[PDB]
């Protein structure tokens, strides 16, 4: 009697629960009715609300009928088994943390969005969503895709083959300039140099039209079929300006850094496409949550990413993610991130939640100000630093305990 | 309404009396050692109340309740399977298996007195559970393993802002492994000779090169729960006459005023050289490591040894800058804050779980003990400890925080 | 008062009529060639005279006089041994030995269509005196020998400091063999391909490539005294199907705004490849070399091809940034401003003496002709031509400028 | 008739030649009365200017027997066979060059002299001398001493031996702070790293009080026995602050770059000594002109340096002469030169002259501000630049043509 136990808990020992009393109780687990895992249960309460134009409260049988298929989720949500149990106040802090971070004036956009925008969207490894501010506005990943594509190539080619072509370390702050390492390979897949070679490994032999759908599919599964778009616009402008990536390409060609059969100039076309893929904070925190969640999309429970692919990517998101800010960043926030010149910080606090912070203004290394100050405050407030202690964490509050 | 009685029927499964060996081999399987200092009252009472018979004997709800009365809740948790590694027993067997497979790979050159066949591994967890195997009671110099330990002491005592005025926090790269300073005219991080030597000059800013040392030993004893920390004046003598590279760094960091006001660079070099020949065994350093793995509370004494500021920063930097030039490949393939050492040492830490120390004197080309490098890989291959595994979805790996 | 007569009676033994053929030998052992352009009128009038007179033929003082009237100024200098190398006959003996001594050095690898036993030295002194040994009339491309010439042409047309808004003037630094731009986002110097490409980018901006090229051909023709200067279309079309590295450099230059505004980098790359495919002979290129040996004036025409501001900058960077990595050891040991080329050319230049081209196609590992550097070493072994050789006290060296 | 032929030429048709007239005829030939190759003659000018009390005034036989033994030297001088025939005009050019450089007011002295000191001095392959400014003030060569010591090493050991221990190429502008090159040899004998090493090659097997004599023996033969001194003061301060040099010293020790059995700390003391050697501009011109003269001292006719050692030392000064300024220096100036932190610049125009400039204030690169201006102007005046032609040199001046 799983459904049975759940009814008594929500229905205050009386005749029944009314309609919104269920859903306001359901919207308090931070779950969202449009969760794909709740599709059935929501379908069927459309059916039973349509039994009368007068009511209706629900009997224990009427209740149990709808939540039949989804009580596994509804129990964990209502007996507060979700990775952040009091999700209700945990959002009231993120609210504050959005608010104080909204007060951060500085930063320059790339050069054409409005520097007013600012939207952070949580998505817990369990599905609990929260968002405040402008989380519905689509934007491009740009270099936020290098992890995602890097994932895809290790997901399909394995680590050994891939790093036969790209390094694994960071190169430091004086050689954010060099292309190849001592062995005539770019140093890691997070710098455009290694990214160009990675792009040259995704689906060799197939043509550039088929190649691109293969990652759009992949990029869709990672966001639980929430909004991933494409901007032809930033695509064409991203190759007309891509003189540096051409440079890299030609130098990769000369010293033979692509697989034997690569039409180098096409691979750059493909690279440039990949950067112009669109997302919203909402759709992109599910992508981050997928990395948070070992490779499984938190709101569809589908496997998208092999764990090697997801480990390797958070590993290099750590070392190599925030450009030259990586060192200081891996230090104070210590959360595998990936910045993007569009302003996206594809934050991940693994085994908890995925974030996407979007506010377009950047800093001198290429990281959203508000994006960066938000993590800082976040780590300050909650024991999320990769090497915080989960037990003796002193003045920090944990949202995984009660 | 009977917490001391609550634990009785777990071992005395509905039995009358219970042998104390039946209780302590039940407590060696908790992984704890009888010499756990937060058991002493339980172990003194039991030694005392073991002076109530001369043939045996054993204890009852009368006696037990009088003895584990003091430390009941640790024995509760210890016996309610409430330790971070519940079946510590089979986890040790894993370590044994990695240890011996990492023994047969006999490449390397000893640095330039030991036998290359030495190979010692020791674990301690944040709950105090310990294990080891091989030559783990053999004292070696911390050498560069001392560096994060000494960093920690500086941050606990001075805060993170202060200590990173004097030494950067990033890893150097496979190019600049020989430059001393980054462009900020600081050594890149506390893990390079350049950076250690600098951190050393921030401990006990004031008192003299004998109080500074005792004070590091005091800390180093607290942190190790009072296991063997020591000091091999023999190494220190040869460290300080063949130390031309270091004297180069010393003179260059003085050249670029990298120490603080009133720093006797040459004496700091002695302290450094001293701190390098500070002796530990794999065992005593397991408690060092697990202490940092434990928010700064010493797992086997319950004593707050370090800031949680201090443990975090150190583990932040052992990750990046820990394995000389192999740190990159290391952070990738094993992604555990480690720290290598010229005598064979690796100070491994699995945060929220355990601390480790490995040891085989033969270094490889890079200067990291062959068998030690081999062993840290294999352990991440095995267990989802790698800093970036998922705790829920981790493929074909074994998590030992689960039964 | 007695000018051509002064010469006329010196080649005669106070005698009757000197035969034309023994005047011919007297002027071939002066080293000049009967085809010197600065002599064409003397040979025109003397073959015309053989055409009319009969039947020896022989030569009166009046029959000698103003055949040589035109070029007597040279012709005296030739005969009173007032040339830079007075006893040129013996000096060719030493070239004939140094050629043969360098003939035995068959090591070295061609680039990848010729044959390695090809070996030719042609000497053009600043006066005109020619000597060749071995295969001098075989045509080869200039390849990166063009860089100094093209560089000269750039500064002769645009002047040092403009050219150097876009190109440094320093020799990169043996291990930084590989980075294109320096700190200021400038290439290092015009001898490196990264600078060649940007130099090329600055000659006759605005014109299109067909004209640019001919503007370069005429220039090269005069420097050679209108001896063979040509263009193999064969090597150019592969120079464009293989220069991936150059394309690398070009785009990176574009990204950093290293070309002038309104530079189509892809055609500047094509123009650049054409300058490498220009061909010459040992004979034709020793006149090019002697031109720079000659403050820019072509020894066998008398024609100012290059500003002295441009001879020097080119000779400078040929000293220091010239022979690629070997230029250090080369500036040390040979101290001559040379320039290597991957076709097998060393554009040797002994300022104030002569211009050589040596040609053996086989390159060494740094890409420089085996026999070329051997000849070059042996040549300064025997003679005080090394840059900082002393012209007065020079030990056992022979000086050819002293009789 | 050779002494008569001389006696007749310098005679103004006057039967009894004055000696005031003789010496100003001699001084203005460049030579000074203190020339050692003229002592015999100058001795007997003291002998016969002792016989009475008048002029005195020599004649066909008195003249003849004083210049009897120095005639062929006094021939070329008065037959204008001296490499710079009209040395006279040549010196006021050097004067203008000095005064033009007089106005370059920038610069910071290191830390003790007063920053208005400035001098130049010339000496030719034949002996003609000139100086202007503060050219009799002792100062330390400091770093100007590395070429001189290198010569002595090559002269005593030969090119082969010496360059088993120091390289021969230039450093490299950005990573100009490395001590060694990838052969573990210091880059060249002109960096403190290679200087220090060159210093251990001199007179192995003999203690440091005697090494220093033999160096000054050499450093005397080379300056024709003009002023060579030594400062213990600067030696004790250089001893007490060159932490960098200790660094480098220790670094060469661990890298085993000295010849076996080298007391590093002593060689550092010897280095600190050798850098504290005292010269004036004057004495240092004969230093340089000895090198300009194939190793024969212009003023004593002694062979001091085998041409080997002279060739090499003037090659390395060209390449590695002026610290990070050497690249641009060899380009624009293209005379082998050698800068010093005191302001010293030991310049050399082979086969014509040696020079030496002093000016305390340095630039941002460790080179005398005005000592630097001075060359740049000099080469802009004379076809001295190593690659100016001796026939066609555009609008420049040649001082070997009359
Ligand atoms: O933007 C600045 C300002 C700056 C300022 C201060 C300091 C430095 C720089 N400088 C820049 N300089 N170049 C840039 C473009 C990247 S370099 C071309 C890519 C590579 N070239 N050689 C490589 N090594 C190998 O390929 C190893 C190899 C091993 C064995 C055999 C062959 C090859 S990779 S940017
Ligand atoms: O061991 C090889 C063979 C090898 C092999 C391969 C390639 C070359 C050479 N060569 C050497 N290896 N170690 C050597 C002594 C190392 S220390 C040099 C003195 C400095 N220490 N930190 C510095 N940076 C800054 O003071 C600030 C700054 C940093 C960066 C930019 C601007 C400003 S400079 S030499």
Numbering used by the authors:
A (entry chain D), D (entry chain A): 138 to 248, 255 to 545
B (entry chain B), C (entry chain C): 137 to 248, 255 to 545
Which sentences did the original study use to describe this structure?
Numerous GAC inhibitors have been reported, with the most heavily investigated being a class of compounds derived from the small molecule bis-2-(5-phenylacetamido-1,3,4-thiadiazol-2-yl)ethyl sulfide (BPTES).
However, the serial room temperature structure for the GAC–BPTES complex shows that one of the two BPTES molecules assumes a more extended orientation compared to UPGL00004, whereas in the cryo-cooled co-crystal structure of GAC bound to BPTES, each of the two bound BPTES molecules adopt an orientation similar to UPGL00004. The extension of the BPTES molecule in the serial room temperature structure is most dramatically demonstrated by the distance between its terminal rings. In this case, the ring-to-ring distance is 18.5 Å, which is significantly larger than the distances between the rings in either the cryo-cooled structure (14.4 Å) or for the UPGL0004 molecule (14.6 Å in the cryo-cooled structure and 14.7 Å in the room-temperature structure). Examining the interactions with the activation loop reveals that the thiadiazole ring within the more linear end of the extended BPTES molecule in the room temperature structure for the GAC–BPTES complex is shifted away from its hydrogen bonding partner, the backbone NH of Phe 322 (4.3 Å distance for the more-linear end versus 3.8 Å for the more cup-shaped end of the molecule). This apparent disruption of hydrogen bonds between GAC and the thiadiazole ring in BPTES, compared to the same ring in UPGL00004 (3.7 Å distance), might partially explain the basis for BPTES having a weaker binding affinity and lower potency with GAC.
